[PDB]
Amino acid sequence: LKKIAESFEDPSSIVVVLEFILFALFFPTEFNRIKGDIQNVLLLFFSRWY
Amino acid sequence: TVTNEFASRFRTIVATLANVVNERAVQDDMQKATRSCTKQWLRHLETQFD
Structure with a gap:
């Protein structure tokens, strides 16, 4: 996965999370191949928000 | 660790301080x-500290 520097401060950072959801819909397989490298972004978002 | 324990503690510090300033x-x-x-x-x- 191409690197994404997201601090996840403002609520609108959810734009990037939204991107990932679309990726698991439009290309479920390629997403499966880069899930994990994506989870590295998701645990930043999740640490910060929850 | 995926997350710095120091930045985490500062973030909880700003959690407390932010609720104190919202109360105020x-x-x-x-x-x-x-x-x-x-x-x-x-x-x-919080992010700069991160």
Whole structure:
């Protein structure tokens, strides 16, 4: 996965999370191949928000 | 670790401090926008510390 520097401060950072959801819909397989490298972004978002 | 324990603790510090400043703001009849501004500056410091 191409690197994404997201601090996840403002609520609108959810734009990037939204991107990932679309990726698991439009290309479920390629997403499966880069899930994990994506989870590295998701645990930043999740640490910060929850 | 995936997450610095130091940045985590500072973030909980700003959790407490931010709720203290929100308490102080609502008690002192402050406009919601200036509140959004102090809250945003606080998140900003949280990421800079991160």
